[PDB]
């Protein structure tokens, strides 16, 4: 007897104060401001939210969102009021209509939603009024809808709840089917599911607990108050910037399983940095409905380690040519010293330290780019990129030449003659380097005129025959500059240094 | 009596038309083309798909995939046909064999899977034939496997379904154990689980509903047709580029829980942009098996806000030195004006607008790079990077010098003399700037020869003693260029401007 | 009778060897080393791990982690020993205390956790000793806590398990409530839940199976051994770099649902590349508790396709101005040829190949940057960026000018005169190009002095009046260089080429 009454409660129960709140997904909105309301369109899985527009007579935005919380479009109700609650009613032709109270014209409206559209005041005046006959000159309410029973509920400032038939209001029929009274801490959201009414309250402080009160529309009295703690960025009651404001609730009934969820919108983050997170209370198995919706819009390919560390290259990779899989990698100096096919300037390995390797998300045919960033703190950071493509018939790779992204720091890119076999001609990678007087003496192809003094070395891009022009500018108080062409591959110098001075 | 028959159905039922389809994960494939089939290797959690090769006599690719849908390797069956279905049979030594019909040689084959391998026609001719004796000169079928019962099923073009024992076919035994007939809308997939046969149909149009027909192998007749709608990128029946083609099904039996799932492959996206998404119908609790597999391969560290906005820096961060946590951030102009340790050119804050801050996914020892991008629309975008490392013994950070990534726009990088205390020597960050005639008059260290005319200022990289060379090129119709070295830190000028003309 | 005993087992059972291990999330740690232990703080959802410090007398780190595995802070116990197990005890004021055995001072300690703090030896000597009276000169144990029953358990090297009351130890009361003996393969973790004791074993090899032994504290004997296989990066027993070491276990009791989970920490990856992954065994419905915690810290906005391919632009996008949604995109050469508002140098489309398009994660007001990377393998890669902002009142976009990131390769950026209507003045984008002798003859505004010979073309940044200076350096063995200003927009040349030689 009892074991079944326990299993049925756990499997089929939907008593709010017995359910655990769980994070569902984040969601957006056009405004850099807190959220206000949240609603689900059960026929599409679209989400709709409202936000203030922050204007002299307050208006609000309506945001149309993907099932994963991304912004599709927004609609502004100029001087429409706070937009505390709205009601969704999808029409037969697939167009969405929004039940809202336009405070500017003092009318209950059923507006057609339009993508990235501004509903100015002059248009709102010409729209059809659906305000009930008994509610003229009494415009202190906002509407919401009970989808399961097709009810249009009106919430009044003084705390009056009016349950009406949506079809009745659409047909200009004034009939109040149910009326109850709701009553430091003020209203943050309201949702109605049949006989059950839910009342969200709590302020943004970390010290203010979030609470949902459950009421019965037949009895008219409170069943219970349900305080609860949510897990934020850093855990329970540790939200980013110590801000956690409740911003609306809605009941969702799964069209297929007919089982229920109560969704809760929270805004976290500090001033000018607000972002919105959806939480929920679920019957057994219903969290998966929204997890799948989140997963569809999530990043499902791993770009970094789960703790924010860059990926490490597999142990079996001993050749940069084989690191063709997209991701953000890092290799330490030891690995950079041994990997095959690293960028060279003759005998010198250009990347002579640890290195970030950004392998681009690939083309549709698995082509990609390797972007290397030499990781040092005492020298400039070198950035180089090369591309590569895969032949889908031979399954062999073709690797392109290296492009250098120009970088410079207030410290020298020092050239040690011995590392280049004492050949300036080895340096054919574009960029600016410095040769000290001591090293100039050791370079075999240094210009005699400045054999014992330092100079900046500048290397140009290639010409049509694969040659690059090297320029030496003497680091002295008089103008002395030389140039000479070098073949980038063979390092053969075309002619001796030519003086410009 | 009834409450238990309801709980048991919900907990232990696996009736297809009572189950909700849920997105599972995306998955890849070597070809830039639609998917064709999908199968699970229960002993490894590997997935296998097939794709056309798009060649004159059609061949197909076999893709070996990770449990999270990433591509491990592929195998091409040159002129093997469409590859509509295949059968997986993992051998004892851990090698995978693929049951497939090679249309080019007109033989049912059991081929060893090889990574990134091309099975050309000459090799396929020397492979062992497993075509049943009664099926020679009748090669209009493809094979599939029922893992739970070790059956090898053959699907014929005319709609004949032949259920055979896999071991029998391997032993060259011709015995048809069961045969039934399946019968605008054509076949997109077939899966067999014991007595239950599933038949997938539907075309790529948004107006064509996806449907799975359930049949009984003992009765031979249809039990029911099950049409359903899937939730795509933007919700129910809103797939990217209005393309949603069904591309195969398979039944999965959990080796541990022995509970079942029916997985469904869809291809979305437009021409040349196809991508594949896995959906599923699950017994209670079985979705978690595949969610964990997706999660293992997903990006589990937050790089951006959930709606695509960049991260905001925490309110407690008032110093760039403290923003060492990986992620893609943005700070507005106000924050950029106040943050400590922002890049300077003397008294001038280089980033004089909003700024993107890319904090690299870190090294294994939590070293990282901060890449700043000044966000403007009327001026060029400045990009600068610096590195930093953490001492694991003292838990103190060491910050490196700033590297400038060279950027230029068809508009000037304007120098206002007052912002640099009227010292050109303050500008020691490498790059090109412009000084108007009016501002040259206000700079104290301007060259007298061009005191009243504008000029481009070019600042080089450092030399060995921390000095940088400034170059001024007069913006006039005659050649006038000067240079002078400046110490990057102290802004001390080594000597007066030296004319090159 | 039996159908209920089956449902109750499946719904309410927590028998370890009947549960499936599932990946939960990855987690970090300050050290580049394997993990050692894992524990949950049920009052915050924080996680705590330990790692060796790899020093001459071994110490260990304590890592405080977010519910999604990110590193909050770490605390080093200098010469504290191996840190094999620890016990969490959260105090009333919200501060965390750690039960640990400090091998350096040979004392059982209850240390206050401090963020990024080094507990040196001199401080550890002045801390209060909680070692039981009967355990002096017998310091071969580490502590752990059974949260549900407030027990402090001591594990000894010889295999002795001592169950004590935590409050007793805090009050310096020496009372052993339960003692049992546990007994190639050694201990990797231990967790106690009431009467149940769990013993983790197995080494890092792929050929060494992970195993948890379940014991009863009342009987003192083993109930059963439970070997199991985990799914790693590439599937079951396919971990990265063939390394899979078990690194601790803990029992978690959900404070709300009172249902249980057994969590297991694994370290994967090769030497110097270790990373940690959390697995778990769950009662029905309890996996969702940790999935929501992972999801809160995951990347929930899609930057790439699920297989690592870059995003494709929607078919309805025929204008770069409309690609304002964040993400990493790629367009092929055909699409780059047709898209409106691509970068131009007069009549020439600069991006004359496939192109990666990085649309930055947006500002709080949906401003973003488009970073283009021309994808070629035989030519240099061009990188250009522009910004754009959205007017929240008009919902119209403002697009900024293009910035060029300087790039160069050892091959030429070839200029074909016909593509620029035979006007060098068309090339106003900053950078270095090459004009062959043949093409110089075809350019109408080439300098006569070098009409028949090649030259590098260098284009500067703009000045105050929107003009850019073009420089031509003759590719000959004698010094010949010219300059001339051109208006970037109208391509009007201000004056003829001015010789520097």
Automatic annotation (TrEMBL), chains A, B, C:
Domain P68 RBP/TagC-like beta-propeller: 34-280
Superkingdom of this protein's organism: Viruses
Name of the protein in its database record: Minor structural protein
């Amino acid at each position: 007897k009892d074991l079944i009454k326990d299993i049925d409660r756990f499997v089929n129960g939907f008593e709010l104060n017995e359910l655990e709140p769980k994070f569902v997904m984040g969601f957006g909105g056009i405004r850099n401001a807190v959220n206000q309301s949240i609603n689900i369109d059960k026929e599409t899985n679209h989400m709709y939210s409202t936000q203030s527009d922050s204007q002299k007579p307050e208006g609000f935005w309506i945001n149309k969102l993907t099932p994963s919380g991304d912004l599709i479009s927004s609609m502004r109700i100029v001087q429409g009021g706070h937009g505390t609650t709205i009601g969704l009613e999808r029409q037969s032709n697939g167009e969405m209509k929004i039940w809202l109270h336009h405070d500017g014209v003092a009318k209950l409206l059923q507006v057609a939603y339009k993508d990235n559209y501004v509903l100015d005041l002059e248009e709102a005046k010409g729209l059809t009024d659906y305000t009930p006959q008994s509610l003229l000159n009494k415009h202190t309410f906002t509407p919401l809808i009970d989808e399961a029973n097709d009810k249009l509920i009106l919430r009044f400032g003084d705390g009056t709840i009016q349950v009406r038939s949506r079809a009745d209001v659409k047909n200009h029929i004034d009939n109040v089917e149910k009326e109850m009274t709701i009553d430091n801490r003020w209203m943050q959201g309201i949702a109605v599911d049949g006989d059950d009414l839910y009342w969200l309250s709590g302020n943004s402080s970390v010290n203010s607990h979030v609470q949902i009160g459950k009421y019965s529309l037949t009895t008219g009295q409170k069943i219970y108050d349900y305080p609860f703690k949510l897990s934020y960025q850093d855990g329970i009651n540790f939200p980013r910037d110590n801000f956690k404001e409740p911003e609306g609730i809605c009941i969702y009934t799964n069209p297929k399983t007919k089982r229920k969820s109560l969704l809760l919108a929270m805004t976290n983050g500090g001033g000018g940095k607000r972002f919105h997170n959806l939480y929920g209370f679920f019957q057994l198995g219903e969290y998966e409905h929204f997890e799948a919706l989140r997963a569809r819009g999530s990043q499902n390919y791993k770009l970094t380690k789960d703790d924010g560390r860059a990926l490490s290259i597999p142990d079996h990779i001993d050749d940069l040519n084989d690191l063709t899989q997209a991701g953000f990698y890092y290799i330490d100096g030891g690995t950079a010293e041994k990997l095959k096919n690293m960028p060279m300037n003759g005998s010198k390995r250009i990347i002579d330290a640890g290195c970030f390797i950004n392998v681009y998300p690939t083309t549709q045919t698995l082509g990609t780019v390797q972007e290397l960033t030499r990781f040092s703190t005492g020298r400039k950071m070198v950035k180089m990129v090369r591309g590569m493509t895969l032949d889908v018939f031979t399954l062999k790779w073709d690797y392109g030449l290296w492009t250098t992204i120009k970088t410079d720091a207030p410290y020298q890119e020092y050239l040690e003659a011995s590392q280049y076999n004492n050949w300036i001609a080895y340096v054919t990678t574009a960029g600016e380097y410095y040769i000290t007087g001591n090293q100039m003496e050791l370079f075999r192809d240094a210009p005699e005129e400045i054999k014992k003094v330092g100079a900046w070395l500048r290397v140009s891009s290639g010409n049509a025959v694969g040659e690059v022009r090297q320029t030496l500018e003497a680091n002295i108080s008089e103008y002395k500059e030389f140039f000479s062409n070098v073949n980038a591959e063979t390092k053969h110098r075309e002619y001796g240094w030519v003086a410009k001075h």
